[PDB]
Amino acid sequence: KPQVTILATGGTIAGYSAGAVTVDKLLAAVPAINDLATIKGEQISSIGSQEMTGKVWLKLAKRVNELLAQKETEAVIITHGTDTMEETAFFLNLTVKSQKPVVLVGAMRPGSSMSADGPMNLYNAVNVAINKASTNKGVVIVMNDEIHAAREATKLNTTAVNAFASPNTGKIGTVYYGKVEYFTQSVRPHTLASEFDISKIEELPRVDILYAHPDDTDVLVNAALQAGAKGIIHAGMGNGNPFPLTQNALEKAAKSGVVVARSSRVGSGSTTQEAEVDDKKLGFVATESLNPQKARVLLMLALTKTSDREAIQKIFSTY
Amino acid sequence: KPQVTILATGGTIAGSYSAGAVTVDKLLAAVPAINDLATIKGEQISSIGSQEMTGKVWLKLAKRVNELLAQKETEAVIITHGTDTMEETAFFLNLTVKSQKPVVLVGAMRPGSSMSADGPMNLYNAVNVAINKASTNKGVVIVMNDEIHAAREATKLNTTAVNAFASPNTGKIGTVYYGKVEYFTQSVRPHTLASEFDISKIEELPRVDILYAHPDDTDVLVNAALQAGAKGIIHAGMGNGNPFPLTQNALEKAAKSGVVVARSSRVGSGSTTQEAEVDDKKLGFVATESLNPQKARVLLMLALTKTSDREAIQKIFSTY
Amino acid sequence: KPQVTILATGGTIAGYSAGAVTVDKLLAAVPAINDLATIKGEQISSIGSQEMTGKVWLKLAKRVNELLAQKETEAVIITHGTDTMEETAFFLNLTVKSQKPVVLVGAMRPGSSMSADGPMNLYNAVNVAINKASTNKGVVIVMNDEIHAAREATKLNTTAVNAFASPNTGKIGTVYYGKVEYFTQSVRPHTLASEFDISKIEELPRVDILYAHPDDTDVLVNAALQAGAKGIIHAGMGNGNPFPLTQNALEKAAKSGVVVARSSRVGSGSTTQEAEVDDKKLGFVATESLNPQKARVLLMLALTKTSDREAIQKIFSTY
Amino acid sequence: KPQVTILATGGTIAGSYSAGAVTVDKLLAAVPAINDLATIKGEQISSIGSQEMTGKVWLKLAKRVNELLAQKETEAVIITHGTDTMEETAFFLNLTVKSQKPVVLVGAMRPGSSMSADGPMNLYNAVNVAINKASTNKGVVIVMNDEIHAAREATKLNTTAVNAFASPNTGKIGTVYYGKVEYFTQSVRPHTLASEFDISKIEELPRVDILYAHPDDTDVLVNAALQAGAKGIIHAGMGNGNPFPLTQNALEKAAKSGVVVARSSRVGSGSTTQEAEVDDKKLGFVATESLNPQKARVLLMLALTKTSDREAIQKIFSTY
Incomplete structure (x- = not known):
């Protein structure tokens, strides 16, 4: 047996x-x-x-x-x-x-x-x-x-x-x-x-997950980054879109070196690259066909060996 | 016409x-x-x-x-x-x-x-x-x-x-x-x-904040919403509205301080029932039942324009 | 209690x-x-x-x-x-x-x-x-x-x-x-x-159910009608469409007084009136938002009190 | 390009x-x-x-x-x-x-x-x-x-x-x-x-016919396909490929006469398993497993261009 x-x-x-x-x-x-x-x-x-x-x-x-x-x-x-x-x-x-x-x-x-x-x-x-x-x-x-x-x-x-x-x-x-x-x-x-x-x-x-909603805030990005997050999975509206205020907050944290990966609260589908938000210009990564909680596990693992926006995006377009 | x-x-x-x-x-x-x-x-x-x-x-x-x-x-x-x-x-x-x-x-x-x-x-x-x-x-x-x-x-x-x-x-x-x-x-x-x-x-x-739960969760997001003056918080918990231990204590603290804590689920469908794993009554939370985190947030802002009472707010979630 | x-x-x-x-x-x-x-x-x-x-x-x-x-x-x-x-x-x-x-x-x-x-x-x-x-x-x-x-x-x-x-x-x-x-x-x-x-x-x-497929036949309509069917639920292709040969067979049986109700093999959705097949002209009824096996129960009951194409269609557009 | x-x-x-x-x-x-x-x-x-x-x-x-x-x-x-x-x-x-x-x-x-x-x-x-x-x-x-x-x-x-x-x-x-x-x-x-x-x-x-099963089913459709010369028949049975008693005997008769009887399901998804309610081996049928009636019909016409053997045809349904 x-x-x-x-x-x-x-x-x-x-x-x-x-x-x-x-x-x-x-x-x-x-x-x-x-x-x-x-x-x-x-x-x-x-x-x-x-x-x-x-x-x-x-x-x-x-x-x-x-x-x-x-x-x-x-x-x-x-x-x-x-x-x-x-x-x-x-x-x-x-x-x-x-x-x-x-x-x-x-x-x-x-x-x-x-x-x-x-x-x-x-x-x-x-x-x-x-x-x-x-x-x-x-x-x-x-x-x-x-x-x-x-x-x-x-x-x-x-x-x-x-x-x-x-x-x-x-x-x-x-x-x-x-x-x-x-x-x-x-x-x-x-x-x-x-x-x-x-x-x-x-x-x-450490990688925190943020939940998007209209009339969104910038204090949760701030608290995650002040608490030492290396990455932040943003579960955005629709195709991974953020509220303008939290987008500013997410752009500042990516410049401060926190890796910001755009996901979605939606539940299914791919949070695509080159949709409404310009990730290259802002410095975010698109999590593609993965939900917030699984995109987080990937980001943690990606972070154990790199922090380059291009290399991390390649991982998301790979696994 | x-x-x-x-x-x-x-x-x-x-x-x-x-x-x-x-x-x-x-x-x-x-x-x-x-x-x-x-x-x-x-x-x-x-x-x-x-x-x-x-x-x-x-x-x-x-x-x-x-x-x-x-x-x-x-x-x-x-x-x-x-x-x-x-x-x-x-x-x-x-x-x-x-x-x-x-x-x-x-x-x-x-x-x-x-x-x-x-x-x-x-x-x-x-x-x-x-x-x-x-x-x-x-x-x-x-x-x-x-x-x-x-x-x-x-x-x-x-x-x-x-x-x-x-x-x-x-x-x-x-x-x-x-x-x-x-x-x-x-x-x-x-x-x-x-x-x-x-x-x-x-x-x-x-103001009503929504938090997304996961293993190895934290208490810093609860506290920030609190400081930022959240009147209520929707917690998209794990499975049937379950919080990571650390974040539950943080949530318990916010409920004592007068912030309405409403347990929802990040799962996507189903109800975040009462009489499940968390003792809402004792902890002072409210179960949002058959509602996703984002609509549960709209119901809570409304409820809050009238009441902060936990029992009443639960009843509102059990009715609408 | x-x-x-x-x-x-x-x-x-x-x-x-x-x-x-x-x-x-x-x-x-x-x-x-x-x-x-x-x-x-x-x-x-x-x-x-x-x-x-x-x-x-x-x-x-x-x-x-x-x-x-x-x-x-x-x-x-x-x-x-x-x-x-x-x-x-x-x-x-x-x-x-x-x-x-x-x-x-x-x-x-x-x-x-x-x-x-x-x-x-x-x-x-x-x-x-x-x-x-x-x-x-x-x-x-x-x-x-x-x-x-x-x-x-x-x-x-x-x-x-x-x-x-x-x-x-x-x-x-x-x-x-x-x-x-x-x-x-x-x-x-x-x-x-x-x-x-x-x-x-x-x-x-008696109401028989027929299953549609390309290269369909006319012998099953024939055998149902010779066996005394009062109604026939045709589980058609897509939006209740039949193969041209069986359509002829279904048009002959409706003139012989058998009530022919068009349904679908598809599984969900409504088999609509005024889509590809003209039911008025041919004498069929459209089963609308109902599957073959439930449309059959309705047809049996409809048949206990009527056999007019217009009245039966009204029932299908009603229940 | x-x-x-x-x-x-x-x-x-x-x-x-x-x-x-x-x-x-x-x-x-x-x-x-x-x-x-x-x-x-x-x-x-x-x-x-x-x-x-x-x-x-x-x-x-x-x-x-x-x-x-x-x-x-x-x-x-x-x-x-x-x-x-x-x-x-x-x-x-x-x-x-x-x-x-x-x-x-x-x-x-x-x-x-x-x-x-x-x-x-x-x-x-x-x-x-x-x-x-x-x-x-x-x-x-x-x-x-x-x-x-x-x-x-x-x-x-x-x-x-x-x-x-x-x-x-x-x-x-x-x-x-x-x-x-x-x-x-x-x-x-x-x-x-x-x-x-x-x-x-x-x-x-x-020629392969498809029959739709329901309570109070009949044997006249089986016999007609037989007379019309069907080489095989797909039976979209009830639940897990179950026939109404009367129509099962008719089907058993067709299988004895050399027509390949393949049990499928009108249900819409899932497999029409073997070792379920009907004894296919003894009755001489073939279970189409994870295939709807209409695709099971295409596989059977193909199988039939090679074989009429029940065991082989079952194996084909268990493979493709």
Whole structure:
């Protein structure tokens, strides 16, 4: 049987020792997985996803690269809370240097809730990890019988069991009662094709996210920059447009060396280059086909190796 | 024919006798078909991009729509507006217009100069919706891409697509295909005449800030809004309105200091429920439920023109 | 406590005597509902939804009107299979003469499946039935924490727990862990405002559904008409367009007195009047904002009281 | 500049030196911008509405796209096609074109004469996608409403909207905004060069009927298709491909008689799985999995040009 390691980041999502007790619990909740793979488990952290920090990210990614280097460790499944699951998977996607499957799975309902999604999500995540076709697909998310590329996925609804979507593309595969089928695959660089390496990095650059609205202000740009932000993701109106006042504030901070990346509050689509705001002239970067919270993870990583407007924009037009 | 007034908030959404406003005059030439259906009056309320929208433009606009709609000769009011913030303007007027006559906001995802410009058709369909019988008492509506959306539900969800507008929580209330208007549903949430908000004597809207949550969040943005004098704050939290621990304490501090903290979600749809993870009652917050951060901000500025009481404000979010 | 009757149409969807044993089972699976309402239960039928017939429909609707006439019967919940659930609810919506809530609920996963949606769907359906706001909303469907108007709902996916959508509008309300919220309501005539009455009707008119495709045929029109169809729903290409050959066949059958209603295979949108095909001249009716399977239920009902092209078209432009 | 050939299957999707086809000539005048990007050749393969499409037009088209793509001077091939059946044509060529050079199908939801006609912009974006580097080896694609859709996944899902096209099971593979092409994904399912289907020596496609299931279903439509000589039948069943009992027995009879019965679903998305309610193996049916009834029909006519074997045909549905 394939050996797989489940890394728990908090509590149980679903209902001898795999290693972590949290993982032994899940294995009791779903005795089913044991006929599928040899499961070992570790407790990477003990938090809720809304408490996650860059430190936990580094910890995880580094631990994931270790596990994946071992010839007898076929894949790694990370049980994660849903709130920030898309940020962690995206990070890992640009930071894990392996062709082996890394599957993040979670649950919209407590395991103690009637009709808890967790058990089937776990059963399905495990079948995807050990599936020959998941190799080279990059980091993926398994929720509600669907398989999403980590670049494309976002949590679009607050409570629905089907809260995960890939607004710009769509899921890449499906897994129904453990049967896995892939129809597409990402074409943008991930994992072994990523230029970022976080072994040696211990702290990530500060990057704040600003939310645009009419009658906007300049004090939040100011406070982020005075608090030491290296980058600022501006979730702008429509096609990444800012209120004239905050634009002035964003132009001053870019001259002060803070990298200002224009995103959008909108929810989907690309925040294009050469639309209404002139980024070359003002010194901003356009985040293109990425939301504010994922554009931030990219900006943090970009900042660990550069701060040139042209080079960062190239990264956004690349990943 | 019915008399319709068109209030221009910026420039021509279609194309590149004087109705009253030059912009309106270029629209009428842009697509003449509109003249065979209504006697149009045009009026320039402001000349800006929707990203430059401000509370004062909002106040002037509403006050004007109310003067126009009191007139028997005026059947409807169409507002050409930029897309970026159309949803906030529409939502504001919806809790602020005291008439059941239709108030229609229309725009274009592409420049009038563009090839396959969407503005002409949206304008034409918009005149049809304004003069249709079934549009009365439906509240303020947005007409874009052959669809009719309720003001409370509409949001621009894509940066560039001609079909950028959606109502994620519900769906469009009707359709308009080459002038043919049909309604299939209607908002059961109070609006217009049934709204308790009256902007008549208001010169200024209170300041309400919106903060975007993420892992490794901070408390400096909360404090700045506080110092900058925010009367209220919308927190687009993680998942079901969840704050990062550090930023929750900062928020708790602002609520003690009298700033109204309303929890929303950066997620995009769904409700930021009560009785979820955060104890709002104990922390002194208010859950905005089925509203995105930006419309939750418009409801809060309004609420604040009347009350700062947490219970009342919660009730307002649970009603509108 | 409100009294409510659950009418079972087949087996258990979820996990003293309410009446039907199927209903006693559900009550054991979800002891929760018993603090909510006084439940009585009946077994209207013992079939899978793909076996449903017009006879079962009449039976149900007639039984529903009876129950709803009783002052102490607050609402009726019908546990139904998902395949044809939209056809039954639509029928009932135009046939139940009451202002009381009629809620259809089902399950995409077996109750014996891990993460079965049935228990929470039942818990939620019961909270909606007894909710003061569900009165006058017409017949509704409760699936996956959502409330759909019966006119608008369709099963859009074969396996997803979230397979129910209202493609043209959207759900009208939500029910999360029993908390119910309505945001919209239908504006098209239902229940007490419907002109149809099925007490006295014992058999419904035959109406076949044809599927359009390039290189289409005329033998299926022919066989439906020779088999005695009174109406034929043509699920056409795009905006209800037919292949020239089958159009000829459809024009001959309309002259032979079969009512031909143009719908679409497309999935959403209105199959408009005065688009590419001239219905007046050819004698067809345009089904407008309705799919093939729901346009068929309407045509059957229209046929119980008329067969004039103008009057039927008015019904399609009405309901 | 790159040389692109435009094959017109009907009329002008935009607008109301000779490229080679008059229609193509009107397109070039409709939007000149296209001439600054490629040297265009035009060609009228047929002049019909897409609802009149037939198997023979499909065969001629493919055979021609293959002659064109063998030529070194030909960089891509754009096919203007009516929307109604664009998805079947695209899917056919996708399992039938032996070249990795891009094959792009474009159309318009509105008449070229219409106000805010979508055809001009779609045409322009379509030329950009055909001449872009990343389009090679992506398979046949449809370009509509600023989006690039894989042929296997595309379907017209709304009767009138300019954004009628979607890929319900996956999503668009990329986007094209004012000529700027980006790809975010690609089909992992075999197409074009990797397809085992070769139409070169084929004069006719076998007859495959599609039946629509519903409660109180019948057996007379199954028998008629049988009598009419159907070689295969697509059954758009209820939910997960479920037939009404009566019609299942009729279908079982056709499978015994050598007609290939392939179970699909009228539902609209999802897969018509195996190991579901019907025992296909025992009944002799084939499950079409993640394919709608109409594309499942195109795959089956193809399969049938090679085999009638149930196992093989199932494998083909499980692969493409």
